[PDB]
Design a protein around this ligand. Structure first.
Ligand SMILES: COC1=C2C[C@@H](C)C[C@H](OC)[C@H](O)[C@H](C)/C=C(\C)[C@@H](OC(N)=O)[C@@H](OC)/C=C/C=C(/C)C(=O)NC(=C(C)C1=O)C2=O
Ligand SMILES: COC1=C2C[C@@H](C)C[C@H](OC)[C@H](O)[C@H](C)/C=C(\C)[C@@H](OC(N)=O)[C@@H](OC)/C=C/C=C(/C)C(=O)NC(=C(C)C1=O)C2=O
Lengths: 213, 213
């Protein structure tokens, strides 16, 4: 089933920094994850200009937020390009990232966490509000895989026999911290999107569950 | 992966009858599926009176409707007792049912389809509005399985490596007919529940997806 990999050292260090910070504007994590989703929709949409059959696995291009209050979990879905087993491994931890040290140096010098995205390491901002992540992803070029981290020194990557089938793309499964359940609520989610994600080319769907009156 | 089984002969016959009928009150299929859900919630709730650890796999007791417009699919979820591989096989087709012939005889004599549930064969009413069903189920006593039918002479039962994990219970996955997509819409669903499912002990949740304004 399930392989384990080592985080490059500064990535550990940065995650540890973020997860431990008192910062007062953690809502930016959603700006980042939405903007990553958009970057991945862009990428597949562009790819299919020269290869239209790439869109076939999943014709609709969207971003979808799903609060799961009962599980203390928030999910950000996209029908973007997705990632293969080897891209999860390389790009999410094992290799040194061009901005990690520079950002941490900026941070300790006074910089706002908000700036994370400009150092190209804004995926790690999710730890502002979550102590476990699953990245579940299906690329047109591979089977569906689950990448998991708890901010420790290592992560796991497992063949997905367990979750619904993504036609194509990626789900970010955030297990929220108990002092961050504000991000489970419709009003809150809507506000953060309004404020920080006005200029997004793709529909952003919110999946909401109400008991029938 | 995937075994195939034979429908007992009258069950085929009845399915063929239902799927082919012009009947003007097909909405009753939802009454039936909700009431089955309730029968399965009852059953686990009762079981755990003498065995409280049975509720642990899924503490919440609910029924959940999820329209999937993009897929022409409606899902009815319950956290009831669920079914094992052997119960799917026995109880959903292979063995002769006590009411099948009697109901078909009632039908051709004038009876309203609405009466199906009183012959204890109301599960088959789903074919009024669907030409494919998946029954995905997880019983505390077995792995999660998928039972599939297209109203033909046979059905399949496959180990589930493909759908999200039910802690416990059952999802009815209806693939609706093109002239029955009315059941994908919030207003419609709500109306049918109001009319036919007033007296239900369990919360009925409706999962709705709206694009953010
Ligand atoms: C230029 O692409 C980006 C990179 C470089 C690569 C990891 C890009 C990645 O390699 C397989 C892919 O092209 C996809 C599109 C990655 C994402 C943008 C994100 O995945 C999502 N959300 O589906 C996203 O993963 C959930 C990417 C995470 C990568 C990191 C660490 C991130 O913070 N910054 C990057 C962003 C925001 C990028 O847009 C980045 O490295
Ligand atoms: C008395 O239980 C019932 C039976 C007899 C058995 C199949 C019961 C079944 O055996 C494994 C289970 O006790 C569960 C609780 C079955 C359901 C009620 C239904 O499953 C759902 N919705 O989770 C439901 O399956 C999705 C049961 C389908 C069974 C048939 C054919 C049905 O139309 N009628 C029955 C109903 C409505 C029952 O309530 C029935 O046979």
């Amino acid at each position: 089933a399930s392989e384990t990999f080592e985080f490059q050292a500064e990535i550990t260090q940065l995650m540890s920094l973020i997860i431990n910070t008192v910062y007062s504007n953690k809502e930016i994590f959603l700006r980042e994850l939405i903007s990553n989703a958009s970057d991945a929709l862009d990428k597949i949409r562009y790819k299919s200009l020269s290869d239209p059959k790439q869109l076939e696995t999943e014709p609709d291009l969207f971003i979808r937020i799903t609060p799961k209050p009962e599980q203390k979990v928030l999910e950000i879905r996209d029908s973007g390009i997705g990632m293969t087993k080897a891209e999860l491994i390389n790009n999410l931890g094992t290799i040194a990232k061009s901005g990690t040290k520079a950002f941490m140096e900026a941070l300790s010098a006074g910089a706002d966490v908000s700036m994370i995205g400009q150092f190209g390491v804004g995926f790690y901002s999710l730890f502002l509000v979550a102590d476990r992540v699953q990245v579940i992803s299906k690329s047109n070029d591979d089977e569906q895989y689950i990448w998991e981290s708890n901010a420790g020194g290592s992560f796991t990557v497992t063949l997905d026999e367990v979750n619904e089938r993504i036609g194509r793309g990626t789900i970010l499964r955030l297990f929220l911290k108990d002092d961050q359940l504000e991000y489970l609520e419709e009003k809150r989610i809507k506000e953060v999107i309004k404020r920080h994600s006005e200029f997004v080319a793709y529909p952003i769907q919110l999946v909401v569950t109400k008991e029938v009156e």
